[PDB]
């Protein structure tokens, strides 16, 4: 392409979030307006947006990022749905430090809806307030007992819920707080998070369920 | 590395001497 001012041929569209988030407008995006065998909506669909939770929800922390996908276009609006979540680079780099044990786990699970998800969890040992020793290491069997409890709690919450109730748990991250309560009888833990979620497979398109998440 | 190279020089001379003598009879 060597077009004279191709920005003369572009239409701006709006981008709209799912109805859970307290702030529902994402921003604006470009596409080339329709021509023979190349429609505008086919260029707008399947695009990914990555947004800080503090721009979706009013009172929240900035260090969780959510991924959203476009599914259909209505008038000048692009309508979006959930695709995953992650932690910012500078958060994870600040937690990993010397003289501690780091514990990690992962699971594959389905909702009551047809979605197949994969989840990752992390936790770190706690220095006790009287401790005069320099290091806070767990023994190998204590680490194995904690990892089974991470997987046990993390599978329980997804199997009996839909994607609506799953995202409502991830916004405050009640999953990581329940693991942090349960493990204190084995070894005290000080940072605990569901640090990443990936989607592996999903059901048919279902316009009625899409609009139930938007009305 | 002069000693390692003097060792290599002797090995190639011995390989020549091997092939030269064992041809004779």
């Amino acid at each position: 392409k060597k077009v004279v001012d191709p920005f003369s041929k572009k239409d701006w569209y709006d981008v709209k979030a799912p109805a859970m988030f307290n702030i529902r407008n994402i921003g604006k995006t470009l596409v080339t307006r329709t021509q023979g065998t190349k429609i505008a909506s086919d260029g707008l669909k399947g695009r990914v947006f990555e947004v800080s939770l503090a721009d979706l929800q009013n009172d929240e922390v900035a260090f969780r990022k959510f991924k959203l996908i476009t599914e259909d276009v209505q008038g000048k609006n692009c309508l979006t749905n959930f695709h995953g979540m992650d932690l910012t680079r500078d958060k994870m780099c600040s937690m990993v430090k010397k003289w501690q044990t780091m514990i990690e786990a992962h699971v594959d699970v389905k909702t009551t809806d047809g979605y197949l998800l994969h989840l990752f969890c992390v936790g770190f040992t706690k220095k006790c307030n009287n401790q005069i020793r320099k290091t806070s290491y767990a023994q190998h069997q204590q680490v194995r007992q904690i990892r089974k409890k991470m997987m046990e709690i993390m599978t329980r919450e997804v199997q009996t819920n839909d994607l609506k109730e799953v995202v409502n748990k991830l916004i405050p991250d009640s999953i990581g707080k329940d693991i942090e309560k349960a493990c204190q009888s084995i070894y005290p833990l000080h940072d605990v998070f569901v640090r990443k979620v990936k989607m592996l497979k999903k059901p048919k398109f279902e316009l009625g369920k899409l609009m139930e998440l938007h009305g | 590395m002069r000693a390692k190279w003097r060792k290599k020089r002797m090995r190639r001379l011995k390989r020549k001497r091997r092939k030269m003598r064992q041809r004779s009879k």
Binding site: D5, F7, S8, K10, W12, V15, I26, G27, K28, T29, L30, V31, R47, V48, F49, S52, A62, T88, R89, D90 | -
Partner: protein
Amino acid sequence: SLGPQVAEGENVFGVCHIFASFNDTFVHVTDLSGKETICRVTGGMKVKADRDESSPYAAMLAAQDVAQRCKELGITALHIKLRATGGNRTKTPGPGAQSALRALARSGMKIGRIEDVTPIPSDSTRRKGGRRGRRL
């Protein structure tokens, strides 16, 4: 030109990708999904000798050239993503990194959040240069 038809009291955001290494620096601004390019300018477009392409000055001149084209197309604020080369290599940003960021601020763009984006392996293929390293 044509940005969004709203033009008072609120911002229109883009994403700026800054890739700063030794040898060169890129300034590249995109749509909020990353799929459509708005403009791209580099250190080697501004200077006329290869030594200077990674310099603080060339990076300042590239950032001023990008910020004028943003306002001309109706964008008012930027999110920033910063890269060093990554992989097997050094993963510290090159010398032109600091100059591009202040130059798009001083030329009137509003600043959103900023992120480090360099690619890191959990473990990697064998690095170039042999067992004895590059020797000088």
